[PDB]
Amino acid sequence: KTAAAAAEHSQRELDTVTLEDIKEHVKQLEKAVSGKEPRFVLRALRMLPSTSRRLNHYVLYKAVQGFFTSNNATRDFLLPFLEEPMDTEADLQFRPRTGKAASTPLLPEVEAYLQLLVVIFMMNSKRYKEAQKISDDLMQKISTQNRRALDLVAAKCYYYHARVYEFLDKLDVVRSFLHARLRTATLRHDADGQATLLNLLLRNYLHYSLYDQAEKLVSKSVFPEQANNNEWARYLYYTGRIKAIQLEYSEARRTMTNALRKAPQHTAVGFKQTVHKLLIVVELLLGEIPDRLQFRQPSLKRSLMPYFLLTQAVRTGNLAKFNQVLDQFGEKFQADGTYTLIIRLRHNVIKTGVRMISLSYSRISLADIAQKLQLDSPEDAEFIVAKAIRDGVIEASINHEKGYVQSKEMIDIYSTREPQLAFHQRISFCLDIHNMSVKAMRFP
Amino acid sequence: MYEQLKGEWNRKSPNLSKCGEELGRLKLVLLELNFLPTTGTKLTKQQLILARDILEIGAQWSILRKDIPSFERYMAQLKCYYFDYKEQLPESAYMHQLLGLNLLFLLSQNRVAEFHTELERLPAKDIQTNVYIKHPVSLEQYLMEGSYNKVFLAKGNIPAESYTFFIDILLDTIRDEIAGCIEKAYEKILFTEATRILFFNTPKKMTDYAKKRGWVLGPNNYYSFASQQQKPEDTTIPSTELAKQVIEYARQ
Amino acid sequence: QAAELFLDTVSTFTSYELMDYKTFVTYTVYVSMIALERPDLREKVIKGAEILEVLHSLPAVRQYLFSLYECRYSVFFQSLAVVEQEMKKDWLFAPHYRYYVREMRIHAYSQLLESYRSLTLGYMAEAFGVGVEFIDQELSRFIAAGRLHCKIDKVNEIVETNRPDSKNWQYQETIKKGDLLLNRVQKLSRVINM
Amino acid sequence: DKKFHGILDQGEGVLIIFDEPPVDKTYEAALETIQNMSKVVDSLYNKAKKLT
C-alpha cells in the first residue's frame, strides 16, 4: 500500500501544482485587467497548453469552487457539466475572494478563459456535447460583452470552438457562427479574430473539399499581415495547398516554403509532415528537384522513402516501377489528398525529363529524346517538345528538319539588372523593420 | 404541379415549341416551393428529381442547338441544383456523364480550378470507375502530356453520353492552341508542314491560317517575323525604378 | 578539410596508427585527388620530396598520380578504375557512388573541355579511352548531374562548351548567394514580428 | 595552367584567343564579403536567440 499511496500523493501534488498554475493564470488576468495589457494575456494563453496535457476532474472542480466564491452562471453551468471524481482525501484552502473581491462582479476575460478551459478539458476527456454547450456559452458571453480586450481573446476562443466542432462534425454548422463573428470582427477591427475564423473556414472547406468556394473566398478576403504566427502559418499553408490544387505552381512553392519556415521548428510535427509531402509532390511535378537535405528529417523517413523512389523515377523517366510502388503505398497519398496529383506526376514525368534533358543538351535529336524517355515515336517526341516550348518552361525549339534547338547568349542589358530589380526590396524590408521598431520602442 | 415529367422529352424533342412547355414547367412545377432546404418532404425530393431531369434535357437541347448563353445558364443551374448532395437518393446515372461533359466544355472555356476541385469532390468517381467521367480526364491528361493527333483519335469516341460535339469544341480550342504553338519561337513553318502533319488538310482552316495571323507565306513556307531584337536599350525604366528606390530611402 | 590538415608529414610513429606510412601516403593521395585538379598542385604536393620518394616506392600510385597531373586520359581511366577497385578493398569506401571516380573525372573533364570550345565526341573518346558511346553516355549523365558546363549537339555529335567569363560565372555565384541570403533574411523576418 | 587566354574550338579547327579583362575581381571580392559577413552572423545569432 505504501507504493500506491506514494504514487497517489505525488499525482495529487502535481494536481495541486496545476491548480497553482491556474491560480497564476488568475493572477495574470488580475494584473492584465489592472494594466490594460493584452500582451501578458498572450503570454498566459501561450503558457496554458504547456500545462494542458495533465489535468484532473477533481482539481478542475477545486479551481471552479474556489474561484467562484460569488455565485455565478459559470459555476451553475460547471456544476452538472463537470463530473468530478468521488471523495478525495486532499483539500485546499479555498478562499481567494473575500469582501470587496467577492462583491465585485466576475471579469469577462477570466469568464472567457474558464469557458475555453472547460471546453479544452472536455475534449481532453473526449466529451462532445458538454464541450459544445460550454463553447456556445463562451461565444454567447463574448458577444454580449463588448469590451475591446475581449475580442483578442475571442480570436483563439473561436479558433478552438470550431476545432471542437470539427470533431463534432458540426464543422459545416459552425460556419454560420464563423461568419457572424467575422462580421463582428469586421465591425470591431479584430484582425486576429478574422484570421482565426478564416483559418477555421478554410479547414472546413478542406474537410469537405470545398475548394472552389475556398478559392473564391480567399481571392476576395484580405488576411492580416500582423496576425499570430501560428494562424499565419496555417492560412498560408492552406492557401498554398489550394493553389497547388489550382495548379498555381510558382505561388504554391513560394507559399509552402514560406509556411514551412514560418512554422516552429521544434513543434508542428504533423504540419511539418504535410509540408514535406506537399513540397515533394509539387516540386516533382514542376521538375524542381526536391531538396535532398530535407530527407534527413527524423520524423519522415518512412514517408519519404517512397517519395525518394518517386524522385528517382521522376529523374529517370520510367513508369512501371513507380506505378508498382504507388499500388503498394499510395493509400497515404490518397489520405493526404495528392493521389490525383500523384497520377499527374506519373504522366508528367516525361515532361520533367524533357526539361532536364533539354537543359542538358544543345541540339538533341527527337529520336534520341524519345528513346531516352520511352516514347518510341518521332511524332510524339515532336509533340512533346512543342508542348514544352508553348508552356515556356524551356527554350527548346522545333525545326521540322531534324529538331534544332537554340543555345544561350552572352549577358545583355537586363541580364545583369534583373537580380537587382528583383532584390532591391531590401530597403523595403529595412523600412518595415524600422517602422516596427518605432511601434515597439515604448519607454515605460 | 407534377405534369408530364418526361412526357415528350425521352423519345425525341427536336421542336422549338417545347421551349414554351419548358417555360411553363419552370413557372408551375420548378417554382413550387424551393430547392434549397431538402430536409424532409420526399415531395420536394421528387421536385429535385424533376429539376435535374429538366436540366439534363435542357443541357442536351443546348448542346444540340449550339446556343452558348442558354447552355451556360443550364450549366450554372445544374451546378447550383446539384450543390445539394443527398446520398440516400440514387446517384450516378445522370451524375458522372453530365459532370464529365460539363467539365470538358469548361476546359474548352479554359478553366482548370473547377475541374480539379470537382475531381476532389469525386475521390473514386473519377479514377476507379466511370469511364463516363474519366474520359475528359484522360483527354486533358494526353493533351497536357504528349499528344495532338493521339488526342484527336482519343476524342473520336465519347463513352459518357455520345454527343460528340465537346470533342469538336476541344478541336477548336486545340486549333487555337496549335496556332499559338506555331506562332511561338519556331524557326520556320512550311505550307505542307502546317497543312498535313498536325490536322486540317486544306480546309477553310487553311485560309483562316493564311489570312488571320502573321508569318506571311513565302515559297510554300511561313516564316517567323521580327520578334527578337538586339534592342539598343534606352534604359529608362531602370532609371525610374532607381528613382523609386531613391525616394524610398530618402525619407523615414 | 581532410587535405588541409592532413598533408602534414609529421607522423607520431614511423609506421603505426594508419597501418603504415605508405598507407598514410595513399590516404593523402586519394584525399588530394578528391580535393583538387591541377593548379599549383605541382608546388603543393608534387614539390614534396617525401611525396616523390613514396611515389617511387609505389609505382602504380605514382602512375595514376602522374597520369592525372599530365592529363593523359588513355592511361588515366584505367588507373582510375584500378584506384576505385583498391578503394573497394578499403573500409574507407564511404563515397561508393559519389567521389571514387565520378568526381575525379568531373574535375578531369572540366580541365579538358575548358580551354576548348567544340571538341568532337569521337576524338575525345579515343583521347579518353575507347567506346565513343560510353563517353557520350558518361557526358550526358554528368551534365544531368550538373557539372561539365557544356552541351551536346547530337545531330552533329559535338561538345559545345559554355564556359562563363570571369564576370559571368562570378555574377552567377553572386546571384546564387543572393538567393540563399534572401531565404535567410526572409527566415529572419519570420523570426521578428512574432 | 592559365598561362594563355584562349579556347580551343576543335570543330572549327582553330583556337579563339580572347583578351581576358582581370579588373573584374570586384565580383569575387564582393562574393567573399557576402559570405564572410552573412554566414558567420545570421545563423549563429538567430539560432542562439531562437525565442524573441
Partner: peptide
C-alpha cells in the same frame, strides 16, 4: 546586395535586440 541588404540586416539586428529587451522588461518588471 551589399548596401540595401546590409542596412536591412543592421536594422533587423537593432529591432530584434530591442524586441528582446522589451520582452524581457515586460516579463521581469514585476
Amino acid at each position: 546586395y551589399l548596401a540595401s541588404l546590409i542596412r536591412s540586416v543592421v536594422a533587423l539586428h537593432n529591432l530584434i535586440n530591442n524586441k528582446i529587451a522589451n520582452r524581457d522588461a515586460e516579463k521581469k518588471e514585476g
